Design goal:
Length: 334
């Protein structure tokens, strides 16, 4: 059945609750972002209306083939009505099109649903600050102190640097990036930027990127591999065996590959794995809050209830996160 943590109490709304068939007493459904944990169940003939950002809707429309009529896009940083409830979508600083949602219930209660997000101080200078928020549905993906990774700013600076090095050194060398779902585009876009390349890819992915309407995207991407000296390949293809296969299958224009895996302490001290003329790099590009980013965020927010939405399936997990919420409540004095 649909769990209590996917339901907005007060309304008949749900958030990312498409894998449960029809939820009883659910007048509208909300999609925070286009990630498959969060959209599973959305067939092209899903018959209830869906509320989301523009971008998430494009991806629904084109990848999952749902009809304009059942797809209600909504602008960011704007007060909107939906089944007579005030709602606002805020940028989640997650993947393209991802949003947090504020529900302003008619009784007076105000609910933030982070969805997936990467807490940032800039969110404290937002619509959020214009009132107290009582309940918080919290992306707790990394709610544990060992989870510390650097700023996206650092990683990309590094990856830009590692890139401009290897190509200025060997101008017949190819940067490659790993990828599966949307997100982490700034990695591969920022390298292409600095080497004045376009970004080559398979068509599914090219299509996926055309949904996101990035400024001047046509001039930053392509499906003809040859012309692009930075290529995106599926994450599974990012191994020495796969990168040989790829370098044969270009017609011998590139003699050396610099790869990147974006999934997973100091950044300058990072060292690759080299086997041949193939350097692979594991880089920690998160689009989720670290322990401290989250902490700061919630401690600023000072919510009354907090409802975690992630690592929710076991009691060890549930009570460990509840301990950290107690610590934060106490430390900040709310
Ligand atoms: C092939 O599958 N890939 C993995 C794997 O988990 N790789 C990376 C890893 O640890 N990752 C993490 C994360 O760290 O949370 C994540 C992020 S969790 C997540 N984030 C979302 O934004 C979202 O919408 N849904 N989810 C679930 C999943 S893959 C990546 C794998 C399987 S076996 C193996 N060696 N790794
Ligand atoms: Ni996500």
């Amino acid at each position: 059945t649909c769990p209590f943590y996917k339901k907005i109490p007060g309304t008949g709304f749900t958030v990312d609750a498409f894998q449960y068939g029809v939820v009883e007493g659910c007048t509208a459904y909300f999609l925070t972002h286009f990630h498959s944990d969060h959209y599973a169940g959305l067939s092209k003939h899903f018959t209830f209306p869906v509320y989301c950002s523009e971008i998430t809707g494009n991806l629904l429309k084109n990848k999952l083939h749902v009809q304009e009529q059942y797809i209600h896009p909504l602008p960011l940083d704007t007060e909107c009505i939906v089944n007579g409830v005030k709602v606002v979508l805020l940028d989640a600083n997650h993947c393209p099109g991802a949003v947090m949602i504020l529900f302003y219930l008619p009784n007076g209660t105000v609910i933030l649903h982070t969805g997936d997000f990467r807490a940032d101080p800039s969110m404290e200078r937002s619509l959020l600050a214009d009132q107290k928020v009582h309940m918080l549905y919290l992306d707790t993906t990394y709610c544990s102190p060992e989870y510390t990774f650097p700023s996206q700013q650092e990683v990309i600076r590094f990856a830009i640097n590692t890139a401009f090095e290897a190509v200025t050194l060997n101008p017949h060398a190819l940067v490659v990036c790993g990828t599966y779902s949307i997100g982490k585009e700034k990695v591969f876009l920022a390298i292409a930027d600095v080497l004045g390349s376009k970004v080559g890819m398979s068509q599914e992915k090219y299509k996926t990127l055309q949904c996101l309407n990035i400024p001047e995207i046509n001039s930053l991407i392509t499906t003809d591999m040859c012309s692009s000296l930075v290529h995106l390949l599926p994450m599974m293809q990012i191994n020495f065996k796969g990168l040989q296969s790829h370098l044969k299958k270009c017609g011998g224009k590139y003699n050396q590959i610099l790869a990147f895996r974006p999934t997973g302490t100091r950044i300058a001290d990072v060292i690759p794995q080299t086997k041949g003329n193939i350097s692979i790099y594991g880089i920690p590009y998160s689009e989720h809050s670290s322990y401290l980013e989250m902490k700061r965020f919630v401690q600023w927010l000072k919510p009354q209830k907090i409802i975690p939405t992630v690592n929710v399936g076991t009691w060890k997990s549930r009570s460990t996160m509840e301990k950290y919420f107690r610590e934060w409540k106490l430390e900040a004095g709310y």
